[PDB]
Amino acid sequence: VYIRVAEVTGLNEVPEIKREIYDGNIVVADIAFIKHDKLTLDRVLKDLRQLAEDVKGDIVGLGEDYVIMTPTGIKVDRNKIRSSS
Amino acid sequence: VYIRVAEVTGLNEVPEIKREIYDGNIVVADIAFIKHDKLTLDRVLKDLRQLAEDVKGDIVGLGEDYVIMTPTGIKVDRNKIRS
């Protein structure tokens, strides 16, 4: 397993993200660039959500600008680590 | 293996980050809180870099606000997926 970072600027990064997930790797995708091209953003996120369903993987937003995508059998624990105090 | 996000406000989240890494889990740490308090940042980073070395995991910046930390056996491929 490795983690790879994607700089998502349009629909042309989706096929390589799919390939990494199918390879059992984790992708953290930067969507900052297309946050204001909502049509393009919606299509990408539709594709990446369908991918997660197709592989029984997970997909979780990370702040405003990133999405974390995991392959089969790797989940995101949604309870954050916070101050012990 | 799972991934867990950490909200790193100070020195008090480092013990739990270490526990997750030792356990074989991945941590994505949001360091935006302490990014501009460079002494605190260097203390936290020294601790997390030492942990990465110790377990032969990895640690790499994700843009400005985040650090991705990986356990033994898991690397971060620094070549990005780009157009």
PDB file of N, CA, C and O in Angstrom, chain A residues 6-33:
ATOM      1  N   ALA A   6      -3.219  13.502  -5.664  1.00  0.00           N
ATOM      2  CA  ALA A   6      -3.649  13.946  -7.034  1.00  0.00           C
ATOM      3  C   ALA A   6      -3.978  15.438  -7.016  1.00  0.00           C
ATOM      4  O   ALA A   6      -4.569  15.905  -6.070  1.00  0.00           O
ATOM      5  N   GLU A   7      -3.550  16.179  -8.048  1.00  0.00           N
ATOM      6  CA  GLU A   7      -3.900  17.596  -8.218  1.00  0.00           C
ATOM      7  C   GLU A   7      -4.983  17.599  -9.275  1.00  0.00           C
ATOM      8  O   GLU A   7      -4.691  17.356 -10.463  1.00  0.00           O
ATOM      9  N   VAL A   8      -6.237  17.695  -8.833  1.00  0.00           N
ATOM     10  CA  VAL A   8      -7.368  17.463  -9.753  1.00  0.00           C
ATOM     11  C   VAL A   8      -7.706  18.806 -10.407  1.00  0.00           C
ATOM     12  O   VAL A   8      -8.168  19.731  -9.708  1.00  0.00           O
ATOM     13  N   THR A   9      -7.463  18.902 -11.709  1.00  0.00           N
ATOM     14  CA  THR A   9      -7.750  20.156 -12.446  1.00  0.00           C
ATOM     15  C   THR A   9      -8.866  20.028 -13.499  1.00  0.00           C
ATOM     16  O   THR A   9      -9.143  20.989 -14.243  1.00  0.00           O
ATOM     17  N   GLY A  10      -9.514  18.863 -13.541  1.00  0.00           N
ATOM     18  CA  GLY A  10     -10.526  18.524 -14.560  1.00  0.00           C
ATOM     19  C   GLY A  10     -10.752  17.029 -14.571  1.00  0.00           C
ATOM     20  O   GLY A  10     -10.221  16.299 -13.706  1.00  0.00           O
ATOM     21  N   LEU A  11     -11.459  16.524 -15.575  1.00  0.00           N
ATOM     22  CA  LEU A  11     -11.772  15.105 -15.607  1.00  0.00           C
ATOM     23  C   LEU A  11     -10.581  14.203 -16.024  1.00  0.00           C
ATOM     24  O   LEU A  11     -10.624  12.985 -15.869  1.00  0.00           O
ATOM     25  N   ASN A  12      -9.501  14.796 -16.512  1.00  0.00           N
ATOM     26  CA  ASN A  12      -8.376  13.981 -16.995  1.00  0.00           C
ATOM     27  C   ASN A  12      -7.542  13.233 -15.913  1.00  0.00           C
ATOM     28  O   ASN A  12      -6.776  12.317 -16.268  1.00  0.00           O
ATOM     29  N   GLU A  13      -7.701  13.575 -14.629  1.00  0.00           N
ATOM     30  CA  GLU A  13      -7.004  12.829 -13.528  1.00  0.00           C
ATOM     31  C   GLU A  13      -7.746  11.600 -12.995  1.00  0.00           C
ATOM     32  O   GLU A  13      -7.166  10.744 -12.310  1.00  0.00           O
ATOM     33  N   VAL A  14      -9.035  11.495 -13.317  1.00  0.00           N
ATOM     34  CA  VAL A  14      -9.882  10.416 -12.771  1.00  0.00           C
ATOM     35  C   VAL A  14      -9.382   9.047 -13.182  1.00  0.00           C
ATOM     36  O   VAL A  14      -9.265   8.186 -12.336  1.00  0.00           O
ATOM     37  N   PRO A  15      -9.015   8.826 -14.482  1.00  0.00           N
ATOM     38  CA  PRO A  15      -8.654   7.457 -14.821  1.00  0.00           C
ATOM     39  C   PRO A  15      -7.395   6.975 -14.059  1.00  0.00           C
ATOM     40  O   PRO A  15      -7.331   5.798 -13.664  1.00  0.00           O
ATOM     41  N   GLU A  16      -6.404   7.848 -13.828  1.00  0.00           N
ATOM     42  CA  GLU A  16      -5.217   7.413 -13.038  1.00  0.00           C
ATOM     43  C   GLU A  16      -5.555   7.220 -11.540  1.00  0.00           C
ATOM     44  O   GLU A  16      -4.957   6.371 -10.900  1.00  0.00           O
ATOM     45  N   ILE A  17      -6.468   8.029 -10.985  1.00  0.00           N
ATOM     46  CA  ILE A  17      -6.960   7.816  -9.584  1.00  0.00           C
ATOM     47  C   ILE A  17      -7.619   6.443  -9.490  1.00  0.00           C
ATOM     48  O   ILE A  17      -7.381   5.655  -8.547  1.00  0.00           O
ATOM     49  N   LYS A  18      -8.421   6.120 -10.505  1.00  0.00           N
ATOM     50  CA  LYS A  18      -9.100   4.817 -10.501  1.00  0.00           C
ATOM     51  C   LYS A  18      -8.069   3.711 -10.485  1.00  0.00           C
ATOM     52  O   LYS A  18      -8.205   2.742  -9.720  1.00  0.00           O
ATOM     53  N   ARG A  19      -7.046   3.835 -11.335  1.00  0.00           N
ATOM     54  CA  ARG A  19      -6.006   2.828 -11.448  1.00  0.00           C
ATOM     55  C   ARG A  19      -5.285   2.594 -10.109  1.00  0.00           C
ATOM     56  O   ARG A  19      -5.042   1.438  -9.718  1.00  0.00           O
ATOM     57  N   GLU A  20      -4.959   3.672  -9.409  1.00  0.00           N
ATOM     58  CA  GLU A  20      -4.291   3.558  -8.075  1.00  0.00           C
ATOM     59  C   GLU A  20      -5.155   2.852  -7.008  1.00  0.00           C
ATOM     60  O   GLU A  20      -4.687   1.960  -6.300  1.00  0.00           O
ATOM     61  N   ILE A  21      -6.430   3.208  -6.943  1.00  0.00           N
ATOM     62  CA  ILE A  21      -7.404   2.562  -6.045  1.00  0.00           C
ATOM     63  C   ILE A  21      -7.563   1.059  -6.364  1.00  0.00           C
ATOM     64  O   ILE A  21      -7.514   0.206  -5.436  1.00  0.00           O
ATOM     65  N   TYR A  22      -7.714   0.738  -7.658  1.00  0.00           N
ATOM     66  CA  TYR A  22      -7.769  -0.644  -8.118  1.00  0.00           C
ATOM     67  C   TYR A  22      -6.475  -1.378  -7.796  1.00  0.00           C
ATOM     68  O   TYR A  22      -6.492  -2.582  -7.604  1.00  0.00           O
ATOM     69  N   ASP A  23      -5.362  -0.663  -7.708  1.00  0.00           N
ATOM     70  CA  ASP A  23      -4.075  -1.272  -7.350  1.00  0.00           C
ATOM     71  C   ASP A  23      -3.939  -1.489  -5.820  1.00  0.00           C
ATOM     72  O   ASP A  23      -2.908  -1.961  -5.344  1.00  0.00           O
ATOM     73  N   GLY A  24      -4.964  -1.083  -5.057  1.00  0.00           N
ATOM     74  CA  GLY A  24      -4.953  -1.255  -3.614  1.00  0.00           C
ATOM     75  C   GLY A  24      -4.268  -0.104  -2.880  1.00  0.00           C
ATOM     76  O   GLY A  24      -3.942  -0.231  -1.679  1.00  0.00           O
ATOM     77  N   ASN A  25      -3.998   0.982  -3.603  1.00  0.00           N
ATOM     78  CA  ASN A  25      -3.372   2.193  -3.028  1.00  0.00           C
ATOM     79  C   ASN A  25      -4.395   3.252  -2.584  1.00  0.00           C
ATOM     80  O   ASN A  25      -5.576   3.166  -2.963  1.00  0.00           O
ATOM     81  N   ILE A  26      -3.924   4.241  -1.799  1.00  0.00           N
ATOM     82  CA  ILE A  26      -4.764   5.311  -1.221  1.00  0.00           C
ATOM     83  C   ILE A  26      -4.462   6.572  -2.035  1.00  0.00           C
ATOM     84  O   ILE A  26      -3.284   6.840  -2.369  1.00  0.00           O
ATOM     85  N   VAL A  27      -5.507   7.321  -2.387  1.00  0.00           N
ATOM     86  CA  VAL A  27      -5.314   8.591  -3.080  1.00  0.00           C
ATOM     87  C   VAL A  27      -5.903   9.722  -2.261  1.00  0.00           C
ATOM     88  O   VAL A  27      -7.059   9.618  -1.792  1.00  0.00           O
ATOM     89  N   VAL A  28      -5.109  10.776  -2.069  1.00  0.00           N
ATOM     90  CA  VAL A  28      -5.602  12.004  -1.467  1.00  0.00           C
ATOM     91  C   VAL A  28      -5.670  12.995  -2.637  1.00  0.00           C
ATOM     92  O   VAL A  28      -4.668  13.318  -3.286  1.00  0.00           O
ATOM     93  N   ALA A  29      -6.880  13.427  -2.973  1.00  0.00           N
ATOM     94  CA  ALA A  29      -7.076  14.294  -4.157  1.00  0.00           C
ATOM     95  C   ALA A  29      -7.306  15.749  -3.767  1.00  0.00           C
ATOM     96  O   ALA A  29      -8.173  16.062  -2.907  1.00  0.00           O
ATOM     97  N   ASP A  30      -6.527  16.653  -4.390  1.00  0.00           N
ATOM     98  CA  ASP A  30      -6.699  18.072  -4.172  1.00  0.00           C
ATOM     99  C   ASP A  30      -7.711  18.542  -5.188  1.00  0.00           C
ATOM    100  O   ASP A  30      -7.462  18.395  -6.382  1.00  0.00           O
ATOM    101  N   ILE A  31      -8.856  19.050  -4.721  1.00  0.00           N
ATOM    102  CA  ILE A  31      -9.883  19.570  -5.649  1.00  0.00           C
ATOM    103  C   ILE A  31     -10.003  21.105  -5.630  1.00  0.00           C
ATOM    104  O   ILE A  31     -10.983  21.645  -6.205  1.00  0.00           O
ATOM    105  N   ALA A  32      -9.041  21.790  -4.977  1.00  0.00           N
ATOM    106  CA  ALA A  32      -9.118  23.254  -4.802  1.00  0.00           C
ATOM    107  C   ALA A  32      -9.401  23.966  -6.099  1.00  0.00           C
ATOM    108  O   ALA A  32     -10.185  24.942  -6.134  1.00  0.00           O
ATOM    109  N   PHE A  33      -8.753  23.485  -7.163  1.00  0.00           N
ATOM    110  CA  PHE A  33      -8.748  24.188  -8.432  1.00  0.00           C
ATOM    111  C   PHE A  33     -10.091  24.253  -9.122  1.00  0.00           C
ATOM    112  O   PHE A  33     -10.326  25.154  -9.972  1.00  0.00           O
TER     113      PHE A  33
END
